[PDB]
Amino acid sequence: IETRKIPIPPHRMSALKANPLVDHCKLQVRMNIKEKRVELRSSKYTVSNEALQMGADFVSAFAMGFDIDDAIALLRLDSLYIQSFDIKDVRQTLGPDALSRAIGRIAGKDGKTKFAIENATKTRIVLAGSKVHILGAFENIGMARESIVSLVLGAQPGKVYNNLRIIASRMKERW
RNA sequence: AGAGGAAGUAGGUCUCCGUAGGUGAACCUGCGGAG
């Protein structure tokens, strides 16, 4: 018998107050969004450390900016990963014109560039300033990560999107 | 002004917060900030 408690940011508290993991994995839950904690407890119907760690990963992935439409995908498919890239990781210049210009390049007006990158490499990303979070299979996470870091190296989004599309097609192909 | 003669050229998304107005709890728009 093991328990795991996770902290949540003060962003998604109403969305966590929305309504089930006891039905999903037979693992008893408690919540308190004023101490920012969510208790996960394993019962006699709870069988595996896989179920424990996957419930923990599902709740933390809902906490870090994804909704349930992209979180029950993590509850369901075991090939699905999350990777959280800080924009402060590997940096091309020392100059502090970073945050606004970089996430203006990555996000794009009305979400055009983030959305086209998502549709191109089949991954699902969310963007909040310094931290950008990628969800999907880890080769798609590698594709989205190399596209985003080539966006912050200062390459144009048209050329980056073209190369991303051709790499995504060659990765979809079997032989 | 005249019929002839002869010639030549052809780039801030999402979420939250503080605002100000709107039709009020909520909610919408605009702005200023943090993730």
Side-chain angles (χ1 to χ4, degrees), chain A residues 1-77 79-175:
Chain A
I1 293 194
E2 184 151 311
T3 195
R4 183 150 322 127
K5 178 187 53 56
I6 210 62
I8 66 167
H11 299 283
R12 310 277 296 147
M13 277 175 303
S14 79
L16 197 145
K17 212 163 167 288
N19 51 354
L21 195 148
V22 303
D23 201 314
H24 304 149
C25 318
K26 306 315 224 167
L27 183 145
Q28 44 178 11
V29 70
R30 288 295 176 276
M31 55 172 278
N32 190 5
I33 65 183
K34 283 321 160 164
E35 64 176 7
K36 305 326 159 195
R37 306 286 177 78
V38 180
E39 296 284 334
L40 286 193
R41 198 166 295 116
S42 85
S43 291
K44 207 47 70 189
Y45 308 141
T46 308
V47 290
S48 182
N49 43 3
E50 309 217 330
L52 196 42
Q53 192 55 46
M54 261 287 166
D57 292 349
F58 154 74
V59 175
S60 46
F62 177 75
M64 63 179 63
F66 290 105
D67 57 44
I68 58 171
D69 203 325
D70 314 288
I72 309 175
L74 257 164
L75 187 134
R76 194 196 302 164
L77 279 79
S79 87
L80 215 65
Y81 293 161
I82 47 168
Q83 281 195 356
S84 43
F85 196 59
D86 50 315
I87 210 63
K88 311 308 204 294
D89 207 359
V90 287
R91 189 61 205 190
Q92 68 278 14
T93 75
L94 299 200
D97 209 344
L99 260 53
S100 200
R101 182 72 49 82
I103 79 179
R105 266 196 212 96
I106 305 171
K109 53 187 296 183
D110 291 330
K112 54 181 193 72
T113 310
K114 162 208 299 198
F115 190 46
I117 277 169
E118 279 190 329
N119 282 357
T121 176
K122 211 47 72 188
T123 195
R124 171 81 185 88
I125 69 168
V126 286
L127 198 140
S130 68
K131 274 198 179 330
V132 66
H133 298 173
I134 306 110
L135 195 149
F138 74 108
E139 64 271 5
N140 300 107
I141 300 178
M143 273 196 280
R145 177 166 291 180
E146 70 183 3
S147 76
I148 283 171
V149 304
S150 47
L151 268 167
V152 299
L153 291 185
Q156 36 178 323
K159 170 87 169 52
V160 165
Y161 180 49
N162 195 8
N163 173 51
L164 175 66
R165 279 178 80 254
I166 59 179
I167 288 180
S169 47
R170 269 108 175 100
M171 203 159 321
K172 286 177 184 175
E173 282 167 32
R174 173 166 193 263
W175 184 87

